[PDB]
Write a protein that binds this ligand. Structure first.
Ligand SMILES: O=C(O)/C=C/C(=O)O
Ligand code: NI
Ligand SMILES: [Zn+2]
Length: 345
């Protein structure tokens, strides 16, 4: 993938059964270079039989998204609204005030998004603790993917909501997720259970630093107050602005029943088309560990997520442990290399 483009994969059912194996596989095909990949699951597969039993599930902290800005640069402020049911949310979402506008091609809906971003602030049913997987689904179950990120809980008993536990996201039209990488620059997986699409933008890891340099220049005040201000998840930057400043990026639209995988240090952002529902969590491979060791974290304590790398280095880099503890490990990351578990491919 020398073009670092978003790739799309159609695993067979046999390939689908071993999660870590297939992630290792798509990396052997260069997928990680785009920062983002789509995985379409076998038609046979389904995580839940029916989504009619969820209208009474509570969204404890719905978020009203106020957006301020102009010329492709925006800052998103969160206003927490009182609790709400999935029924209530859908009712608001499908109301005339908040529903999807009519359009022909995607390119048109995208233009309207970037044109009306700051008007009529929508509500996002985001960061809801929970899963919609049926208890017995053993393939790609976001609640229990069984990757080495499990060493965090296994070793320390620590749970970090949304990171090694699942989150649910109820969206409506024009609800957004700002530019960011994952906590500790982990992987993530995102499954769209149902509803209208979710569109994504992505910047290749090998160009991540370019985007940060651009963002620091456009938000000097935020940059001075925090070493990793993009981790606040408040900064929106349109594709025209990226284009204008030569930041490479790709686009992809996610349909219900599809997986998105994001890769270590892959910046991504996007928006929802209308009423929908998504589930996500983080995960790891051996390749992540070095990213974990070098992740630049939020220094102003708004983003509190810090994972101790010690168990990972000890168990998977024993020859570098003493060097690393003494701050003399100057390993340099090559974003093009696949995770070692792909040696088998
Ligand atoms: O569904 C969302 O809000 C996006 C979550 C993610 O960044 O994976
Ligand atoms: Ni993310
Ligand atoms: Zn910060």
């Amino acid at each position: 993938n020398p073009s670092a483009r978003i790739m799309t994969f159609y695993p067979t059912m046999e390939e689908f059964r071993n999660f870590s194996r297939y992630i290792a596989y798509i990396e052997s095909q260069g997928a990680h270079r785009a920062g983002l990949a789509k995985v379409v699951p076998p038609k046979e597969w389904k995580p839940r039989a029916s989504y009619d039993d969820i209208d009474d599930l509570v969204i404890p902290a719905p978020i009203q998204q106020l957006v301020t800005g102009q010329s492709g640069l925006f800052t998103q402020y969160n206003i927490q609204k009182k609790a709400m049911t999935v029924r209530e949310f859908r009712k608001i979402a499908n109301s005339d005030k908040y529903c999807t506008p009519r359009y022909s091609e995607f390119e048109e809906l995208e233009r309207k998004y970037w044109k009306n971003l700051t008007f009529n602030p929508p509500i996002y049913g985001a960061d809801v603790n929970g899963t919609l997987y049926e208890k017995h689904v053993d393939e790609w179950n976001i609640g229990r993917l069984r990757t080495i990120l499990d060493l965090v809980e296994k070793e320390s008993g620590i749970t970090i909501e949304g990171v090694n536990t699942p989150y649910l996201y109820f969206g409506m039209w024009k609800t957004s997720f700002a530019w960011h990488t994952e906590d500790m620059d982990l992987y993530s997986i995102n499954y769209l259970h149902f509803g209208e699409p979710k569109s994504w933008y992505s910047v290749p890891p090998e160009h991540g630093k370019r985007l940060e340099r651009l963002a620091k220049g456009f938000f000097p005040g935020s940059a001075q107050s925090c070493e990793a201000f993009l981790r606040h998840k408040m900064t929106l930057i349109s594709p025209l602005m990226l284009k204008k400043y030569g930041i490479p990026f790709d686009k992809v639209t996610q349909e219900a029943g599809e997986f998105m995988i994001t890769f270590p240090y892959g910046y991504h952002a996007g928006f929802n088309h209308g009423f929908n529902c998504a589930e996500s969590t983080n995960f790891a491979t051996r390749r992540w560990i070095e990213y974990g060791k070098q992740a630049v974290l939020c220094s102003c304590r708004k983003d509190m997520v810090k994972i101790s790398m010690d168990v990972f280095v000890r168990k998977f880099q024993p020859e570098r442990y003493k060097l690393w503890k003494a701050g003399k490990d100057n390993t340099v990351i090559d974003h093009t290399l696949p995770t070692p578990e792909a040696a088998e491919f």
